[PDB]
């Protein structure tokens, strides 16, 4: 709907969709969902053509389906924290990303070397 003077912490995730499948002990699944939004981010249920990426700390039923399709990329729920603690858009890392399309993974392969 509409709004007035929103009280968002930052806009780092401005116009950025987010889909959380599962979280961790310290932080529950619906943990980042709330935060992200506060940082000017969008939270959906199912990943689509207008989705940045997925956030999954482990492998689950739903998460799997997304993996099989090999269309989107999976990321750990921790990477999100680094942004909440530094209030900035932290650069993707090989330790945070769990699954990356064959078009993106290739790029990382080089970096490793």
Curated annotation (Swiss-Prot):
It is found in: Nucleus. Residues 8-97 form the BRCT domain. It comes from the Eukaryota. Testis, thymus, prostate and heart. Transmembrane segments: none annotated. It is linked to LIG4 syndrome: Characterized by immunodeficiency and developmental and growth delay. Patients display unusual facial features, microcephaly, growth and/or developmental delay, pancytopenia, and various skin abnormalities. DNA ligase involved in DNA non-homologous end joining (NHEJ); required for double-strand break (DSB) repair and V(D)J recombination. Catalyzes the NHEJ ligation step of the broken DNA during DSB repair by resealing the DNA breaks after the gap filling is completed. Joins single-strand breaks in a double-stranded polydeoxynucleotide in an ATP-dependent reaction. LIG4 is mechanistically flexible: it can ligate nicks as well as compatible DNA overhangs alone, while in the presence of XRCC4, it can ligate ends with 2-nucleotides (nt) microhomology and 1-nt gaps. Interacts with XRCC4; the LIG4-XRCC4 subcomplex has a 1:2 stoichiometry and XRCC4 is required for LIG4 stability. Component of the core long-range non-homologous end joining (NHEJ) complex (also named DNA-PK complex) composed of PRKDC, LIG4, XRCC4, XRCC6/Ku70, XRCC5/Ku86 and NHEJ1/XLF. Additional component of the NHEJ complex includes PAXX. Following autophosphorylation, PRKDC dissociates from DNA, leading to formation of the short-range NHEJ complex, composed of LIG4, XRCC4, XRCC6/Ku70, XRCC5/Ku86 and NHEJ1/XLF. Interacts with DCLRE1C; the interaction is direct. Interacts with APLF. Belongs to the ATP-dependent DNA ligase family. This is DNA ligase 4. It comes from Homo sapiens. The chain holds residues 654 to 759 of 911 of the full protein.
């Amino acid at each position: 709907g509409s709004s007035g003077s929103s009280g968002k912490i930052s806009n780092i995730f401005e116009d950025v969709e987010f889909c959380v499948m599962s979280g961790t002990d310290s932080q529950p699944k619906p943990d980042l969902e709330n935060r992200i939004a506060e940082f000017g981010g969008y939270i959906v249920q199912n990943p689509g053509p207008d989705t940045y990426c997925v956030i999954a700390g482990s492998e689950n039923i739903r998460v799997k389906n997304i993996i099989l399709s090999n269309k989107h990329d999976v990321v750990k729920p921790a990477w999100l924290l680094e942004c909440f603690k530094t209030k900035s858009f932290v650069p993707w890392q090989p330790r945070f990303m769990i699954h990356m399309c064959p078009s993106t993974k290739e790029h990382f392969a080089r970096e490793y070397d």
